[PDB]
Each structure stands twice: as structure tokens, then as C-alpha cells.
Amino acid sequence: GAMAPSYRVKRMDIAKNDEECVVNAANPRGLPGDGVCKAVYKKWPESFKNSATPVGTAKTVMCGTYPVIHAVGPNFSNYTESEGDRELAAAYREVAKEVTRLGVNSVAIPLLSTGVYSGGKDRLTQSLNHLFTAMDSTDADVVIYCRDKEWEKKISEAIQMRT
Ligand SMILES: [Cl-]
């Protein structure tokens, strides 16, 4: 556990994180995929051995001694808003369990279901709030990774509003 568990946000490639483990925005099949998933595949390809896992779950595979937590958010193209929201909250709960089990002091995490799986909607607040619901009871330092300046601003504001 971190001495003073915190949330932070950084606008950079999650494949260049400075934390003790990473959460992949995985697909259910363990495929190299696109976006965050493709970056994670290029950086830690060994972590895709038997990484396939259902929607709403997380499966950890080691790359060397570096844990990759493959978290499978729903594709809102396919899910109803209601069932998609349940599966998205469940994926983050499984991430919290894995972060705790591993005993890490820090984790790098993307906002699940906010890219190709968003079904063309802005899901920053929905996804971030499920992340907080799951991770608030953990003592790891959480570092959220994003790409766009206006996402960075909004995520930073949301963290600060609770502090
Ligand atoms: Cl996504």
C-alpha cells in the first residue's frame, strides 16, 4: 500500500507508465486489438498468453515480474446502456481485487469503455465514477492515463473535487 494513497492523471502513453503494474483496456479474446490494447501488446506481448477473459472481468498475466491486468469493458455498440453500465462497474471491481491481491503500491489505469467501446458516446464521467467506486477502498496510488487535453482537464477536476 502507498503511504498516502492518491489519485493522479497523466496525459501520456500508458505503455510508458511509472507504476508497479498496468491495466489493459483488453478485448475478451486476448487479441492485440487497437488503441491502449495495441500499445500494451507492443510493450508486454508476453502478457497476452491465455489473457482471454469475459466481459466484466479482469485477468492478470505477468510479463517478467511486471503484472498486466487485462480488464474487459463492455462494447456499448453491443450492450444495452443498463447492462453495459453493470458490466463496466463489474470490470473495475475485478481490477480492484487484482490490484489488492498483487500487493502493488501503484497501478496505471485507462478509462475503460471510453474509446472504440464507447458506442460513440462521451463516457468520461460514467467510466471514471465506476473506477472511483472500485478503487476508493484500495490503498494503491492510482494513476489514470489519457490522451486528450480536455479529458486530462476534466479528470483532474473530478479528482480535485473530492480532495
Ligand atoms: Cl475502449
**Residue 37 dihedral angles phi and psi, to the nearest 5°:** -60, -45
Residues 114, 137: Cα–Cα separation, whole Å: 23
**Is 143 annotated as contributing to ligand binding?**
no
Residue 104 near residue 126, CB atoms below 8 Å: no
Residue 156 one-letter amino acid? S
Residue 90 near residue 57, CB atoms below 8 Å: yes
Please identify which residue in the block is written with the cell numbers 496510488: 141
Beta strands in 17-88, from DSSP E residues, in sequence order? 22-25, 58-63, 66-71
Neighbours of 29 (CB within 10 A): 12
Give the pairing type, strands 106-109 and 141-146: parallel
111 C-alpha to ligand 1 centroid (Å): 8
**Is 119 annotated as contributing to ligand binding?**
no
